[PDB]
């Protein structure tokens, strides 16, 4: 009967869903590529225990008498029970197991999940042959963000190992959503809110219109880059003294500048929206997206653009609690944004007690234009996903753009002292 408050991010998704109530545009997902055999019966039991201990995966969303949303907690069965289902799809024998799995996930992601039914996720274990497996985690964005996907996978594996070893299942170690929401409420009521509002509105008084090279589920094209191609990003990071994600952001900024010739470029950057220890370990949806405005002047080196990114990010991080969707509402119209550049944080390979799982993105969220999603590291290799609004980009277009970008990025990283407007951008 308890009516739980939504996080700001959840409020955002809720409002956006209302614009297209039967749509699936806020269906997101990821998967684990697993290099050895798993026991589906045991993993199915592990999923049940994992979900049972994950409040957000046992939640539904309802409206009160004033039409305002709230979250309701619905434990699984030993008031609706959260259902738990791990599908087993044996593609061992198929001509193209990987392709069939992708097709299955794409069709699942296209399936609407009504918010008033608890358990807003979809789970499938694929057998691919050669003993390889794929675990698909499909969710409604309102219950799970990128950070929480990692929290889920780690817990799932932990429970699976215990059930496999005969060991007692370790207690879950998640945080509390109500306290996380209370933290946001405290922020909104604080003096910092006013200061943040002033900071962000001040930066965009000219209200630059978003430029491309409504929010819809993306067409996704993925490019695998081995370490031979990606190590150079690490070397650029070492040389500039900037974290490699900053090098990538600078690369996107330079790419946009070189393509369009535009002085002032905007990219959008996600931040976790998690403040404090409790928030960091609470599965849910709290992520924020903020505009990074960058001036790329004539004759600047790539290293100089990295510095420009670092300066802008310092300000973004210092005012990161202000909601991106709030900034847009105040500026009006289409708001302010560029391609979303999402360099996912490091995730250790997921240990299933022998078999190891490597995470890859399936769909990070809907977009009005483009998301650029990276998983991996310079040393281990990268998966680069270009997620394009289907009314803007065709699949082939995204493939071409993504290869062009990675080539330019690699050239920049190979010599940060080079002048950006002298670096050849090849079509």
Min CB(110)–Cl ion separation in Å:
19
- Cα–Cα dist 110/103, whole Å: 11
Neighbouring C-alpha atoms within 13 Å toward the C-beta of 26:
25
Q: Which residue has the tokens 């358990």?
A: 119
Of 368 and 399, which has the nearer Cβ to ligand UM2? Answer: 368
Of 301 and 364, which has the nearer Cβ to ligand UM2? Answer: 364
Of 141 and 274, which has the nearer Cβ to ligand UM2? Answer: 141
Min CB(176)–ligand UM2 separation in Å:
21
The site for ligand UM2 (CB under 6 A) is made up of 9, 12-13, 141, 270, 287, 289, 325, 364-365
Residue nearest to ligand UM2 (CB): 365
Give the torsion through C-alpha atoms of 282, 287, 288, 294, to 10 deg: 120
x/- contact string, 94-133, with Cl ion (CB under 5 A)?
A: ----------------------------------------
Contact flag: residue 56 with Cl ion (CB under 5 A): no
Under 8 Å between Cβ of 113 and 14: no
Q: Which contacts (CB < 8 Å, 24+ apart) does range 88-91 have?
A: 88/40, 88/44, 88/124, 88/125, 88/127, 89/124, 89/125, 89/126, 89/127, 90/126, 90/127, 91/126, 91/127, 91/128, 91/129
The pairing of strands 340-343 and 86-90 is unpaired
354 exposure class (CB count in 10 Å sphere: 0-12, 13-18, 19+): exposed
- Cα–Cα dist 296/261, whole Å: 9
- For residue 106, the partner it binds in ligand UM2, Cl ion, none, with Cβ less than 5 to 8 A by kind, is none
Min CB(364)–ligand UM2 separation in Å:
5
Query: Quick one: which of 29, 69, 146, 339 contacts Cl ion (CB under 5 A)?
Result: 146
Contact flag: residue 145 with Cl ion (CB under 5 A): yes
Identify any residues that bridge with 122 across adjacent strands, giving them in sequence order: 138
- Using CA atoms, how far residue 58 sits from 7, 148, 155, 299, 352, in Å, is 16, 14, 15, 54, 24
Of 122 and 288, which has the nearer Cβ to ligand UM2? Answer: 288
DSSP state of 263: S
- Phi then psi for residue 418, to 5 deg, are -65, 145
Contact flag: residue 33 with Cl ion (CB under 5 A): no
Of 9 and 362, which has the nearer Cβ to ligand UM2? Answer: 9
- For residue 9, the partner it binds in ligand UM2, Cl ion, none, with Cβ less than 5 to 8 A by kind, is ligand UM2
- For residue 13, the partner it binds in ligand UM2, Cl ion, none, with Cβ less than 5 to 8 A by kind, is ligand UM2
Contact flag: residue 287 with Cl ion (CB under 5 A): yes
- Cα–Cα dist 394/267, whole Å: 21
Of 335 and 376, which has the nearer Cβ to ligand UM2? Answer: 335
Of 240 and 364, which has the nearer Cβ to ligand UM2? Answer: 364
Min CB(270)–ligand UM2 separation in Å:
5
Consecutive H or E run containing 88? strand 86-90
Of 75 and 112, which has the nearer Cβ to ligand UM2? Answer: 112
- For residue 325, the partner it binds in Cl ion, ligand UM2, none, with Cβ less than 5 to 8 A by kind, is ligand UM2
Contact flag: residue 385 with Cl ion (CB under 5 A): no
- Cα–Cα dist 302/296, whole Å: 10
- For residue 25, the partner it binds in Cl ion, ligand UM2, none, with Cβ less than 5 to 8 A by kind, is none
Q: Contact positions toward Cl ion, by CB under 5 A?
A: 145-146, 287
């Amino acid at each position: 009967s308890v009516r739980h408050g939504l996080t700001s991010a959840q409020h955002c998704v809720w409002l956006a869903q209302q614009l297209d109530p039967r749509g699936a545009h806020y269906r997101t997902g990821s998967c684990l590529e697993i290099d050895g055999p798993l026991d589906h019966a045991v993993l199915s039991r592990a999923l049940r225990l994992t979900v049972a201990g994950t409040e957000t995966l046992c939640s539904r969303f309802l409206t009160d008498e004033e039409g305002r949303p709230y979250r309701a907690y619905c434990p699984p069965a030993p008031v609706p029970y959260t259902p738990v289902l791990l599908r087993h799809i044996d593609l061992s024998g198929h001509e193209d197991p990987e392709g069939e799995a992708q097709r299955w996930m794409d069709r699942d992601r296209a399936t609407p999940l009504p918010l008033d039914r608890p358990g807003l996720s979809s789970h499938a274990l694929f057998t691919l042959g050669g003993g390889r497996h794929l675990y698909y985690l499909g969710v409604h964005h309102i219950v799970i963000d990128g950070t929480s996907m990692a929290l889920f996978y780690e817990r799932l594996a932990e429970v699976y190992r215990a059930l496999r070893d005969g060991r007692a299942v370790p207690a879950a170690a998640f945080g509390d959503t109500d306290r996380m929401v209370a933290g946001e409420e405290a922020y909104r009521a604080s003096a910092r809110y006013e200061r943040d509002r002033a900071y962000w509105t001040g930066l965009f008084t000219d209200r630059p219109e978003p430029v491309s090279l409504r929010a819809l589920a993306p067409t996704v094209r993925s490019l695998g880059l081995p370490p031979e191609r990606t190590e150079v990003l690490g070397r650029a990071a070492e040389a500039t003294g900037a974290h490699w994600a900053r090098v990538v952001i600078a690369g996107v900024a330079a790419f946009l500048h070189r393509t369009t010739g535009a002085r002032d470029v905007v990219v959008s950057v996600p931040v976790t929206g998690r403040y404090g220890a409790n928030a960091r370990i609470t599965p849910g949806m709290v992520s924020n997206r903020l505009p990074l405005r960058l001036a790329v002047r004539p004759g600047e080196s790539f290293a100089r653009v990295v510095e420009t990114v670092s300066e802008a990010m310092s300000g973004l991080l210092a005012h990161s609690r202000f909601r991106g969707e709030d900034l847009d509402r105040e500026l009006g119209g289409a708001g302010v944004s560029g391609p979303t550049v999402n360099v996912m944080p490091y995730i250790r390979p997921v240990d299933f007690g022998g078999p190891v799982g490597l995470m890859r993105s399936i769909s990070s969220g809907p977009t009005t234009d483009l998301n650029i999603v990276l998983t991996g590291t310079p040393e281990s290799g990268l998966r680069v996903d270009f997620e394009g609004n289907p009314q803007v980009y065709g699949g082939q277009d995204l493939t071409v753009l993504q290869e062009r970008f990675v080539r330019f990025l690699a050239e920049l990283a190979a010599d940060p002292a080079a002048t950006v407007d002298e670096v050849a951008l090849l079509t």
